[PDB]
mmCIF file of C-alpha atoms in Angstrom:
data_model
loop_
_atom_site.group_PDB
_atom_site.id
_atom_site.type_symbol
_atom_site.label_atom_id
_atom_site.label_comp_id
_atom_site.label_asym_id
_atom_site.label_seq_id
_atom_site.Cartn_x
_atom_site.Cartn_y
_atom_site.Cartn_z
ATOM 1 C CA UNK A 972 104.614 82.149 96.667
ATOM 2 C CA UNK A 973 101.478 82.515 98.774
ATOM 3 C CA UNK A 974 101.936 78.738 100.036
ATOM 4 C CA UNK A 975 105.606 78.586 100.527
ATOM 5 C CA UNK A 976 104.932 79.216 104.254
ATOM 6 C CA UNK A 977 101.718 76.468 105.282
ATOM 7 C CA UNK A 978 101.447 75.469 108.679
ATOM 8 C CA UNK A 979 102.134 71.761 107.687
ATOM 9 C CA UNK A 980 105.932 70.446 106.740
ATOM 10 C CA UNK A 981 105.886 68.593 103.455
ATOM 11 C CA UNK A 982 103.527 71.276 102.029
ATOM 12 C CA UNK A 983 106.066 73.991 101.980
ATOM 13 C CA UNK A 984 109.346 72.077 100.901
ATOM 14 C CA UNK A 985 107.318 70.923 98.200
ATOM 15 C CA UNK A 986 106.242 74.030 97.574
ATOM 16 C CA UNK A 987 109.480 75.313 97.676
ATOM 17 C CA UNK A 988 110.755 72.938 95.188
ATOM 18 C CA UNK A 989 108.020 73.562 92.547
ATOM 19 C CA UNK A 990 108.956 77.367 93.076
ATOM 20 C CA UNK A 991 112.556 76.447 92.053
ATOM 21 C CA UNK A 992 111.626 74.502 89.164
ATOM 22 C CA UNK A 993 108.910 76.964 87.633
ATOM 23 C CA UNK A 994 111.743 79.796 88.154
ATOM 24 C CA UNK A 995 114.454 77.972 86.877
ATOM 25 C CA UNK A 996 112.916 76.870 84.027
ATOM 26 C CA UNK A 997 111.141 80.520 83.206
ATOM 27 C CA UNK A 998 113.970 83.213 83.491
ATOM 28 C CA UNK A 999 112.084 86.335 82.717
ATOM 29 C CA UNK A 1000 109.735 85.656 85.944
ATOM 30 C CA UNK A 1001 112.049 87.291 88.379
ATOM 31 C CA UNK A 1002 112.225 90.777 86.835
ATOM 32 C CA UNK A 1003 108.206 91.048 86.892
ATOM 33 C CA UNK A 1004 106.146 93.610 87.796
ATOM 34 C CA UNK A 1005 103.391 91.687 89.973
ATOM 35 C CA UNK A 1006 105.327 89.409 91.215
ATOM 36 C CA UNK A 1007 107.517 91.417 93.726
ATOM 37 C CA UNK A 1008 104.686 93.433 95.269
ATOM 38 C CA UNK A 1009 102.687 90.449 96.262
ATOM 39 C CA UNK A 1010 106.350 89.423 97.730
ATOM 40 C CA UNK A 1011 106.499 92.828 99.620
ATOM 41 C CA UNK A 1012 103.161 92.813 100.468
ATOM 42 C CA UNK A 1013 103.529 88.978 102.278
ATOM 43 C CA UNK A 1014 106.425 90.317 104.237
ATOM 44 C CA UNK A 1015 104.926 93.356 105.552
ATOM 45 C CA UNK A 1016 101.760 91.235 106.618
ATOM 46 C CA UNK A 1017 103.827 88.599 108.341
ATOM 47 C CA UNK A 1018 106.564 91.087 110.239
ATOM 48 C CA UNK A 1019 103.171 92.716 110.625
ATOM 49 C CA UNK A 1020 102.110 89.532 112.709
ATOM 50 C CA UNK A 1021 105.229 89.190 114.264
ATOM 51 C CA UNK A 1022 104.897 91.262 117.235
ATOM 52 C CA UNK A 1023 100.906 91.195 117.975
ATOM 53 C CA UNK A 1024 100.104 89.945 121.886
ATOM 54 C CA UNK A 1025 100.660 86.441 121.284
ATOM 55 C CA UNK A 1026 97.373 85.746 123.658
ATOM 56 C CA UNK A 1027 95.233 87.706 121.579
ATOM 57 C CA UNK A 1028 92.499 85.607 119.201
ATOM 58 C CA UNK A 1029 91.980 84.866 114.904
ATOM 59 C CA UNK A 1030 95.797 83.990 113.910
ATOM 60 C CA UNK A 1031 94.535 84.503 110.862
ATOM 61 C CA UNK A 1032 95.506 87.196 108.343
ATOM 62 C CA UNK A 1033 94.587 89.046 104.650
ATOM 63 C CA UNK A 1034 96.484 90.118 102.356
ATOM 64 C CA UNK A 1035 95.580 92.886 100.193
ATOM 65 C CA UNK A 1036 94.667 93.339 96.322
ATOM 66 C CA UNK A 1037 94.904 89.549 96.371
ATOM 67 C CA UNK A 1038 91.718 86.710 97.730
ATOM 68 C CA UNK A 1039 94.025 84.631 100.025
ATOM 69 C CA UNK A 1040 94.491 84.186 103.980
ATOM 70 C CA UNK A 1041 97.213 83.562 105.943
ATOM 71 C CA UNK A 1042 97.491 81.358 109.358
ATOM 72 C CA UNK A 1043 100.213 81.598 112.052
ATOM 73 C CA UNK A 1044 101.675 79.056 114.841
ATOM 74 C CA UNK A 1045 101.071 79.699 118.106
ATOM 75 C CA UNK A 1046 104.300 80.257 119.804
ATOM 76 C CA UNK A 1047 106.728 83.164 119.358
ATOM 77 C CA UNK A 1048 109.985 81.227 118.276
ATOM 78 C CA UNK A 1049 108.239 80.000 115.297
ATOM 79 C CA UNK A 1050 106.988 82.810 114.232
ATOM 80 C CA UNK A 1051 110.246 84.438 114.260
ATOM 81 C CA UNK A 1052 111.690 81.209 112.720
ATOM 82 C CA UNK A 1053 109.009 81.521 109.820
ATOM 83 C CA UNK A 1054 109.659 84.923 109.464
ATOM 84 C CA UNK A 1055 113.359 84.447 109.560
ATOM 85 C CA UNK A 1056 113.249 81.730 106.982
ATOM 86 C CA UNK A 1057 110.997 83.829 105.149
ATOM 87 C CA UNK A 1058 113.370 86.788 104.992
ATOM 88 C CA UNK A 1059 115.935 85.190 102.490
ATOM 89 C CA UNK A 1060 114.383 84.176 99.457
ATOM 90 C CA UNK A 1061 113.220 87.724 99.148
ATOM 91 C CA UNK A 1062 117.097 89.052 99.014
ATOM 92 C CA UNK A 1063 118.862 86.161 97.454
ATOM 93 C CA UNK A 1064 116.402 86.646 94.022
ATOM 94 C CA UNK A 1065 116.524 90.607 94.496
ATOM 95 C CA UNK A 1066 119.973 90.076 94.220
ATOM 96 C CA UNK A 1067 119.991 87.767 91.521
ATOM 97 C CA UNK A 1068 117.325 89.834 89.021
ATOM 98 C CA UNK A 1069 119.781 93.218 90.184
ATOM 99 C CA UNK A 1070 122.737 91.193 88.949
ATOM 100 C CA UNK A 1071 120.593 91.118 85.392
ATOM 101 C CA UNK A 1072 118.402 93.602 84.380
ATOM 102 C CA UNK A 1073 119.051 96.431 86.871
ATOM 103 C CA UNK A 1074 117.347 99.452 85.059
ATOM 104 C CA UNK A 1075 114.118 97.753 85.107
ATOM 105 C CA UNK A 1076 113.810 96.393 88.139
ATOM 106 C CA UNK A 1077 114.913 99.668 89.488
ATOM 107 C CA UNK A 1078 112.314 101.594 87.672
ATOM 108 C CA UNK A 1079 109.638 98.753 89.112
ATOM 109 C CA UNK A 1080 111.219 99.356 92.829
ATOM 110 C CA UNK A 1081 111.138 103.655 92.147
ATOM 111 C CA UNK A 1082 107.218 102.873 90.873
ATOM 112 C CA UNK A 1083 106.031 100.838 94.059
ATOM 113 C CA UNK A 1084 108.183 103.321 96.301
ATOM 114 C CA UNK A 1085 105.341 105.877 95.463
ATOM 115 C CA UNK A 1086 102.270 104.151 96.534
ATOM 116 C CA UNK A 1087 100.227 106.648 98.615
ATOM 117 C CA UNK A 1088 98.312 103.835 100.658
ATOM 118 C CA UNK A 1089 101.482 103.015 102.167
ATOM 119 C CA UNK A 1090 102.828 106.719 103.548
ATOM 120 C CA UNK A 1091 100.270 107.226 106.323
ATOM 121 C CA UNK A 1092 101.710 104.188 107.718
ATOM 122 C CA UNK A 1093 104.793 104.774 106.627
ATOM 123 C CA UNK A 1094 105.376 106.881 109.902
ATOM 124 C CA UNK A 1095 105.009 102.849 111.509
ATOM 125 C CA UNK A 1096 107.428 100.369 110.732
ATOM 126 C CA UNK A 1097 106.585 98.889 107.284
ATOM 127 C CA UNK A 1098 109.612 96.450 106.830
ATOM 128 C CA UNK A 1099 108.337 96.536 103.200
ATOM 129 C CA UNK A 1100 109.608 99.958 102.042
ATOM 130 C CA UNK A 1101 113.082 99.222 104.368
ATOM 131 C CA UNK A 1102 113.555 96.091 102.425
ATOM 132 C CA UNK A 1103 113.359 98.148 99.264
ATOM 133 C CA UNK A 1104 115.600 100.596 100.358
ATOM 134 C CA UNK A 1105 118.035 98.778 101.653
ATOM 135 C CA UNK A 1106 118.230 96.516 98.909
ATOM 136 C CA UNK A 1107 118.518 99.024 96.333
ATOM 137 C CA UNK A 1108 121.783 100.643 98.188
ATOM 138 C CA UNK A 1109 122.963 97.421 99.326
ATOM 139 C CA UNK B 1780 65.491 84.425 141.718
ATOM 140 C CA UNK B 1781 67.185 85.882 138.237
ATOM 141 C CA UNK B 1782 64.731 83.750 136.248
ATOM 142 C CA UNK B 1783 61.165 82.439 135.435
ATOM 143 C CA UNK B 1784 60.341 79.109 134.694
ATOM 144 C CA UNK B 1785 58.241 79.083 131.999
ATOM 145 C CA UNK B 1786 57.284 75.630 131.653
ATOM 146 C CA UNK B 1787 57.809 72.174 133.858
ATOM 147 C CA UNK B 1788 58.748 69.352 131.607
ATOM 148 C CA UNK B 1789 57.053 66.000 133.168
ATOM 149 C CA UNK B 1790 58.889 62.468 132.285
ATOM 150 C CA UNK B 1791 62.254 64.529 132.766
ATOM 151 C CA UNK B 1792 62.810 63.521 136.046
ATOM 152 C CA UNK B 1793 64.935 61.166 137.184
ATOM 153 C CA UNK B 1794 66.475 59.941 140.663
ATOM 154 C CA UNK B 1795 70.191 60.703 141.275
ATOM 155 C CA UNK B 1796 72.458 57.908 143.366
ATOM 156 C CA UNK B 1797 73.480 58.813 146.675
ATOM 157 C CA UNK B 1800 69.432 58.300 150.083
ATOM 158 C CA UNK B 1801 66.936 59.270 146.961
ATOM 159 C CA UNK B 1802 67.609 62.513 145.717
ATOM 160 C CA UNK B 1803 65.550 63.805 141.957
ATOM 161 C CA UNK B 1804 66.227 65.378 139.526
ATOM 162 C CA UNK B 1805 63.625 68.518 138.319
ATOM 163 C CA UNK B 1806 63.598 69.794 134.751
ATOM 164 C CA UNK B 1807 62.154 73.437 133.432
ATOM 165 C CA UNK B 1808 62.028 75.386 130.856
ATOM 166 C CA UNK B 1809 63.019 78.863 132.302
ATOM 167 C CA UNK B 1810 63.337 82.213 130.690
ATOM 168 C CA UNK B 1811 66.293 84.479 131.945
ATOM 169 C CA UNK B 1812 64.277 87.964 132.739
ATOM 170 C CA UNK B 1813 65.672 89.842 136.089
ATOM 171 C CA UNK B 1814 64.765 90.611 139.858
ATOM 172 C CA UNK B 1815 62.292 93.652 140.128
ATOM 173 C CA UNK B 1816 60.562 92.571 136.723
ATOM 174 C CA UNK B 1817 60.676 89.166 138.023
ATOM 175 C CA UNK B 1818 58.640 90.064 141.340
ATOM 176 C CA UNK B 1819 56.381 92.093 139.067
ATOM 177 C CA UNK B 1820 55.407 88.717 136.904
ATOM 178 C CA UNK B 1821 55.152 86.724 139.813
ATOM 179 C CA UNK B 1822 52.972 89.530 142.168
ATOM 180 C CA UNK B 1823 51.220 89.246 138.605
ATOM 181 C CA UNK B 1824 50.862 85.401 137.579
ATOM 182 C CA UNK B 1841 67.861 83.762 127.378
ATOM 183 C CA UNK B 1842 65.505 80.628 126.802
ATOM 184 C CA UNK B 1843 67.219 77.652 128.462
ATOM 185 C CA UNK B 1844 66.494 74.185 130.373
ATOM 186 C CA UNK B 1845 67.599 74.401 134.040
ATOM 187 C CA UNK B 1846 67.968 70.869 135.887
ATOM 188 C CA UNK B 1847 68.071 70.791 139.849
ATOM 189 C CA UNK B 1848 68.599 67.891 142.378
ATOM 190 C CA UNK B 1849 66.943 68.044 145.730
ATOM 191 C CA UNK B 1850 67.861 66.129 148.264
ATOM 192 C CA UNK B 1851 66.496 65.060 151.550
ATOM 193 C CA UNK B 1852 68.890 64.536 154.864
ATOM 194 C CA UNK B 1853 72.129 66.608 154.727
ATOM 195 C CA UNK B 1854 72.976 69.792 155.275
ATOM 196 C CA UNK B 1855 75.882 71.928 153.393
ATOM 197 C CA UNK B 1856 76.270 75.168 154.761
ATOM 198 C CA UNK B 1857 79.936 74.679 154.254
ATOM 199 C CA UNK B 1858 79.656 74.408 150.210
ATOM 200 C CA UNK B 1859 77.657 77.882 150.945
ATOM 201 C CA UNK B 1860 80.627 79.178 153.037
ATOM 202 C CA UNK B 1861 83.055 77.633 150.276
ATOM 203 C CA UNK B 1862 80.941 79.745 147.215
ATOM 204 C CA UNK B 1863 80.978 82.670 149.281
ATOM 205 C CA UNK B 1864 84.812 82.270 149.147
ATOM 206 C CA UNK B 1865 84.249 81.522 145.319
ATOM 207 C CA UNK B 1866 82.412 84.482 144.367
ATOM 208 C CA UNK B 1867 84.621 86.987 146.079
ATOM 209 C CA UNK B 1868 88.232 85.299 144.326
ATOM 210 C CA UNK B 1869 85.948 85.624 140.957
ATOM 211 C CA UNK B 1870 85.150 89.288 141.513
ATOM 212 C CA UNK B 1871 89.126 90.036 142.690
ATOM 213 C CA UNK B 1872 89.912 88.509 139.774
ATOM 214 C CA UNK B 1873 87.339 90.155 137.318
ATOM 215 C CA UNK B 1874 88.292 93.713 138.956
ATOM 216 C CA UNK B 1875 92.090 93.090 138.801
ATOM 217 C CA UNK B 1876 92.109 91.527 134.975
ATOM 218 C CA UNK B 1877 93.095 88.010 134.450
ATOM 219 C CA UNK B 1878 92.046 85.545 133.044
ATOM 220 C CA UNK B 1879 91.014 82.312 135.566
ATOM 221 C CA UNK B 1880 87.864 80.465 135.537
ATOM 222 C CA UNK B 1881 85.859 79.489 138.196
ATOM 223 C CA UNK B 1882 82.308 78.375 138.170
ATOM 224 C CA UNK B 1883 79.917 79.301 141.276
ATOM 225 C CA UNK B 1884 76.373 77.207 140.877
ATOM 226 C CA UNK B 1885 74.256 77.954 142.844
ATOM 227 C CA UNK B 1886 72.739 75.948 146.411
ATOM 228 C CA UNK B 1887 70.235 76.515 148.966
ATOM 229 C CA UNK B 1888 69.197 74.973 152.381
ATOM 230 C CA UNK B 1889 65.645 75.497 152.451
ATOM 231 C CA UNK B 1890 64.785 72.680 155.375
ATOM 232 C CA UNK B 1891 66.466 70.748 157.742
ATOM 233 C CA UNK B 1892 68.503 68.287 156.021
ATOM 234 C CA UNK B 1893 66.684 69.179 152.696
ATOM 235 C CA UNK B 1894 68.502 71.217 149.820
ATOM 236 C CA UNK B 1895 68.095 72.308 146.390
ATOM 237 C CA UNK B 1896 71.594 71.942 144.082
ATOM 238 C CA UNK B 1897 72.029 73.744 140.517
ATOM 239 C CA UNK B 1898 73.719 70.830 138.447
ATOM 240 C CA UNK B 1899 76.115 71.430 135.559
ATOM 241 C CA UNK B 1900 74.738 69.902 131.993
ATOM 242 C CA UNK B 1901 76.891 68.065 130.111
ATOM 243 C CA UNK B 1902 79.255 66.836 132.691
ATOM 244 C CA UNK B 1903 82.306 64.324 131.892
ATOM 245 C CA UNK B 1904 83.693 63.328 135.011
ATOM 246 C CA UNK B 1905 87.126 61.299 134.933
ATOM 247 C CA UNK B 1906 85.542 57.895 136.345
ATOM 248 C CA UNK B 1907 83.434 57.626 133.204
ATOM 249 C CA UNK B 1908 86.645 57.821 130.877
ATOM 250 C CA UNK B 1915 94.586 57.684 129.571
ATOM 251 C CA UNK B 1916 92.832 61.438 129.547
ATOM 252 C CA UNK B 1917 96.096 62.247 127.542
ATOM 253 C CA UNK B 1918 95.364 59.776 124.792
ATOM 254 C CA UNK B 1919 91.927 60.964 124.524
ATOM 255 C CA UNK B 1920 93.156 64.457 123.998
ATOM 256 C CA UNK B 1921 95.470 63.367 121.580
ATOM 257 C CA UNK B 1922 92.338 61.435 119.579
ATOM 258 C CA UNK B 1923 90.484 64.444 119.326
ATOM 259 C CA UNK B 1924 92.361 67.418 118.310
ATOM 260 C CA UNK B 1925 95.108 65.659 116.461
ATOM 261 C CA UNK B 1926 99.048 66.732 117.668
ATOM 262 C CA UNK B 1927 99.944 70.128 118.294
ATOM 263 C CA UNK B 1928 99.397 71.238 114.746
ATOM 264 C CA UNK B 1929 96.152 71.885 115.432
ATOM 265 C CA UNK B 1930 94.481 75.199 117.442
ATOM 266 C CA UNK B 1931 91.976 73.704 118.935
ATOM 267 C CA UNK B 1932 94.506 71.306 120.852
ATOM 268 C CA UNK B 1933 96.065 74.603 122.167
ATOM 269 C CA UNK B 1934 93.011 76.155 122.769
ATOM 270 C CA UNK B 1935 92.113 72.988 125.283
ATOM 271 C CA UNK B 1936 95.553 72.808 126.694
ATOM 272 C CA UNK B 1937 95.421 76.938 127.640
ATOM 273 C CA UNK B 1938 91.514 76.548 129.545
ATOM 274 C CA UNK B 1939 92.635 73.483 130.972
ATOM 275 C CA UNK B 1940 95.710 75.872 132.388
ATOM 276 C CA UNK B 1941 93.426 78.780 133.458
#
């Protein structure tokens, strides 16, 4: 998941592919309990980067309870591109682990919903928690 | 006057091409002005290299840094970003001069510029191609 986004080209449709195989071939991966936060957790760190002073310095970026970096382009239309592209794998396999096992993902979405880290900035944008929200009444 | 030499390096010296101008090497030790005039009433580490020459004078580069030095401090007090460097000259005898010289200098008769560029920081997928390409700009 981390590398599905690299600053190269091959790397990430490769990527990408592996992704589809591994959760293709392993059902029960998409109703996890680890694997959606780190999802979340990406997506608040990149929409996060989004909107930053493009002229500022260090593109680079951390994502928490995890050892891994992330690096940006330069220019603003592909970062909203990236983030863009970004923002759809997220929904279609929400959608797709709802349309199986609802009560437990729903118990895992209720469960993250409650971190206390996240209300202090809660009163910023977090696109995390909207995601969630949205998704679950969507 | 901002600085002390500290020591005179001896087989340094060299003569420039124009007319014999030299070149003189020291090692000088960035201290101040009033501390400075202490020292030398009394008697940051870097290698300064100067160029006198004998039989022109070029009290319009002094105009032209005076010009230099005020754009650089309208620009410093406003808050931009635009680079310009002001070395330092002085007329000390009829026809005889003292230049500051700039180490480390590439100028374009020595090297297409574009291709070279392209050789060393790869295509745009890398930052420190951008990073060239914006101080070139500025």
């Amino acid at each position: 998941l981390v590398n599905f986004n690299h600053i190269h080209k091959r790397i990430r449709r490769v990527a990408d592919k592996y992704l589809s195989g591994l959760v293709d071939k392993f059902p029960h991966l998409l109703w996890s309990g680890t694997v959606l936060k780190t999802m979340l957790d990406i997506l608040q760190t990149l929409s996060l980067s989004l909107s930053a002073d493009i002229h500022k310095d260090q593109p680079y970026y951390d994502i928490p309870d995890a050892p891994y970096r992330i690096t940006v382009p330069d220019t603003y239309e592909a970062r909203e591109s990236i983030v863009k592209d970004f923002a759809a794998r997220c929904g279609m396999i929400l959608q797709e682990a709802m349309k199986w096992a609802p009560t437990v993902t729903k118990s895992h979405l209720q469960e993250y919903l409650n971190k206390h880290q996240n209300w202090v900035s809660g009163l910023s944008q977090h696109t995390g928690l909207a995601m969630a929200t949205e998704s679950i009444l969507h | 006057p901002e600085a002390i030499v500290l020591d005179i390096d001896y087989k340094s010296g060299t003569p420039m091409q124009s007319k014999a101008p030299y070149l003189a090497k020291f090692k000088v030790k960035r201290c101040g002005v009033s501390e400075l005039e202490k020292e030398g009433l009394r008697c940051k580490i870097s290698w300064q290299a100067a160029i006198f020459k004998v039989g022109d004078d070029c009290r319009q580069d002094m105009l032209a840094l005076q010009i230099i030095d005020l754009f650089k401090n309208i620009f410093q007090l406003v808050g931009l970003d635009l680079f310009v460097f002001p070395y330092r000259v002085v007329a000390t005898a009829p026809g005889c001069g003292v230049i500051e010289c700039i180490p480390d200098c590439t100028s374009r008769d020595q090297l297409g510029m574009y291709d070279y560029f392209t050789r060393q920081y790869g295509d745009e997928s890398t930052l420190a191609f951008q990073q060239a390409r914006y101080n070139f700009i500025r």
